Design a protein around this ligand. Structure first.
Ligand SMILES: CC(C)=CCC/C(C)=C(\F)COP(=O)(O)OP(=O)(O)O
Ligand SMILES: [Mn+2]
Ligand SMILES: [Mn+2]
Ligand SMILES: [Mn+2]
Length: 508
C-alpha cells in the first residue's frame, strides 16, 4: 500500500514521447518484412512462439494468422509428420490456441501402449508439457502426456537454466498466463540468445515501456476518482487497493484500446473489495439483508432511508458509478445496459449473502453446493459482464443475452477462479479446502493437491467451449473470461511483481 495517490501523480515516464512512438512504427515495418523471410514451418512456429511470449502478438495478428492457416493446410501432408517431440508439441499447442483442429493422435508415435511415453529430451518434454494444457475432456493421450511430463519435470529438482524452465512450467504453464505477465522475463531470455533478432528484441522493449507509460497515465485518472469518493477516509478498512485492482484489469485486457475497460474494471474490483469486506467481516446479518435489498431495488431514496451510516456512502458510490457506466455506454453507442449490469451486481451481492448466512448458521456445505454459490461470489459472472459492456463496441444484444443465460464457459471458468482463490488461504467461514476435507477426510495437503487437479480438469471443459465456433461469444469476449482466470493463477503465485510490471521500465 505504498503506491498512494501522491506517488501515482508524480510519475512522468519518458516513453509517452512522440519520438518513441515513431521509432515503434519504424520497427514494426522492418519486423514485418523480416517475417516474410521465415519460410521454414518450424522456424515459423518458433517465430509465433517468440512473438506471443514477447508481448508483441497483437501487433502482427494477420501475419500470425497467415502462418498458422498455411501450416494447417499442410499438416495433413504425407511427409509433414516428423518424429520430433518438440516440433510436434509446438505445432499442436499453437494450432489449438488459435482454434485450429488438431488430433491428439499426433503424439501416438511417441507413446508405447505398454510402457507409455518414450523420451529423454528435455526440450521435447517441456514443449509436450505445455501442449498438454490444451487437452480436451477424454483425450487419454494428452492426460497421459501430462502425467509423464509432470513427473519428469519434478525430477528435474531432486544446466542451471534447465531447472528454471522446469520450475516455471510447473508453477504456471503458458496456457495459464496472460500475455504481458511473462513479457519481462522472456525479453531477458530472448536477449541472451545467439539467434535473437535484434530488431524484434528492441521492439519488445520499446512496446513494453510504452505500455507502462499508458497504464501510469490511466492510473493517475483512476487514482483521482478514488480519492474523490473518499471511501478510504470513511471506512478505516477501505485500504487503498487501487494498484492491486488495476493489476487485475491489466491482466484482463492489456491492449491500449481497452483503456475504458480497465478503468471500469479497476473501480469495480475496488468496490467489490470494499463490499466483500462488509459481507464477511464488518456487517451484521440484518445490515447485509438491507444492503442486499437496496441493491435489488436499485432505489437511492430507499437506500438512503434504510441503510446504516457506514453503508450509505458505500452504496451510493456503487450506485452512481454503475449509473455513470450506463450513461457512458448510452452516450457512446446508444445501447441501454443498466438492467444487465445491475442484474449482475445483484447476483454477486446475493451470493455474498448466502455465504454470510452459512457462516452464522455454522453450516459446512458440500463442495459442489459451495462451488455453485462460490462461482458467483468470486465475481466471475460480474467481471465478464463488466468486461463485455465496457470493452465491446458495438455491443451485440444476442451476445449479451448469452452471458446472462449463465453459459457453461462462464460456469467452469468461475469455478476455477473460486477454487484458485480458495487455495490462497493459509493453513491457519469454510472454503473449498475445508469443504473437501470435511467431505473426504483427506488432509489439508492432499486436499490442496486434489483441488489443484480439479482446476486442470475444468480447464479441459473450458478448452472445449473456447473451440466451439458456434457460440454467440466472439473470440475476443472469451479472452476476457480466460484472462481473468489466468490472473487468479498468477496472483496465487505472487501473493513485488506488480511494481515491476507497472512502474519499472526495461532499460533500453
Ligand atoms: C475481485 C477480483 C476479480 C479480483 C480482486 C482480488 C480478489 C479475489 C478479491 F478482492 C476478493 O477477495 P476475497 O479473497 O476475500 O474473496 P472471497 O471472500 O469471496 O474469498
Ligand atoms: Mn467473501
Ligand atoms: Mn473476503
Ligand atoms: Mn478468498
Amino acid at each position: 500500500s505504498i503506491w498512494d495517490h501522491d506517488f501515482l501523480q508524480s510519475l512522468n515516464s519518458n516513453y509517452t514521447d512522440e519520438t518513441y512512438k515513431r521509432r515503434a512504427e519504424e520497427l514494426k515495418g522492418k519486423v514485418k518484412t523480416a517475417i516474410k523471410d521465415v519460410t521454414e514451418p518450424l522456424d515459423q512456429l518458433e517465430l509465433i512462439d517468440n512473438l506471443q511470449r514477447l508481448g508483441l502478438a497483437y501487433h502482427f495478428e494477420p501475419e500470425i494468422r497467415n502462418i498458422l492457416r498455411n501450416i494447417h493446410n499442410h499438416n495433413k501432408d504425407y511427409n509433414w509428420r516428423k518424429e520430433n517431440l518438440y516440433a510436434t508439441s509446438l505445432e499442436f499447442r499453437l494450432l489449438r490456441q488459435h482454434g485450429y483442429p488438431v488430433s491428439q493422435e499426433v503424439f501416438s508415435g511417441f507413446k508405447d501402449d505398454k510402457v507409455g511415453f518414450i523420451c529423454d529430451d528435455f526440450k521435447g518434454i517441456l514443449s509436450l508439457h505445455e501442449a498438454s494444457y490444451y487437452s480436451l475432456e477424454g483425450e487419454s493421450i494428452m492426460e497421459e502426456a501430462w502425467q509423464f511430463t509432470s513427473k519428469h519435470l519434478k525430477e528435474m529438482m531432486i544446466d542451471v537454466f534447465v531447472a528454471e524452465q522446469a520450475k516455471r512450467a510447473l508453477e504456471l504453464p503458458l496456457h495459464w498466463k496472460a500475455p504481458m505477465l511473462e513479457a519481462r522475463w522472456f525479453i531477458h531470455v530472448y536477449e541472451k540468445r545467439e539467434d535473437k533478432n535484434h530488431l524484434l528484441l528492441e521492439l519488445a522493449k520499446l512496446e513494453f515501456n510504452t505500455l507502462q507509460a499508458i497504464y501510469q497515465e490511466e492510473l493517475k485518472d483512476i487514482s483521482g476518482w478514488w480519492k474523490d469518493t473518499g471511501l478510504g477516509e470513511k471506512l478505516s478498512f477501505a485500504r487503498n487497493r487501487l494498484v492491486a485492482s488495476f493489476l487485475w484489469s491489466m491482466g484482463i485486457a492489456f491492449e491500449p484500446q481497452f483503456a475504458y475497460c480497465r478503468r471500469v474494471l479497476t473501480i469495480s474490483i475496488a468496490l467489490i473489495t470494499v463490499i466483500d469486506d462488509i459481507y464477511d467481516v464488518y456487517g451484521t446479518l440484518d445490515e447485509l439483508e438491507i444492503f442486499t435489498d437496496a441493491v435489488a431495488r436499485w432505489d437511492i431514496n430507499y437506500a438512503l432511508k434504510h441503510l446504516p451510516g457506514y453503508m450509505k456512502m458505500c452504496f451510493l458510490a456503487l450506485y452512481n458509478f454503475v449509473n455513470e457506466f450506463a450513461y457512458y455506454v448510452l452516450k457512446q453507442q446508444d445501447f441501454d445496459m443498466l438492467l444487465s449490469i445491475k442484474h449482475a451486481w445483484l447476483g454477486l451481492i446475493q451470493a455474498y449473502l448466502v455465504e454470510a448466512k452459512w457462516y452464522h448458521s455454522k453450516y459446512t456445505p458440500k463442495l459442489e453446493e459451495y462451488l455453485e454459490n462460490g462461482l458467483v461470489s468470486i465475481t466471475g459472472p460480474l467481471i465478464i459482464t463488466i468486461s463485455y459492456l465496457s470493452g465491446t463496441n458495438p455491443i451485440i444484444k444476442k451476445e449479451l443475452e448469452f452471458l446472462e443465460s449463465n453459459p457453461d464457459i462462464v460456469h467452469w471458468s468461475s469455478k476455477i477462479f473460486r477454487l484458485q482463490d480458495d487455495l490462497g488461504t493459509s493453513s491457519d467461514v469454510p472454503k473449498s479446502i475445508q469443504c473437501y476435507m470435511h467431505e473426504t477426510g483427506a488432509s489439508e495437503e492432499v486436499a490442496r493437491e486434489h483441488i489443484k487437479d480439479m482446476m486442470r480438469q475444468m480447464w479441459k471443459k473450458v478448452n472445449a467451449y473456447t473451440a466451439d465456433k458456434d457460440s454467440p461469444l466472439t473470440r475476443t469476449t472469451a479472452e476476457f473470461l480466460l484472462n481473468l482466470v489466468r490472473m487468479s493463477h498468477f496472483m496465487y503465485l505472487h501473493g513485488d511483481v506488480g511494481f515491476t510490471l507497472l512502474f519499472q521500465p526495461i532499460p533500453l
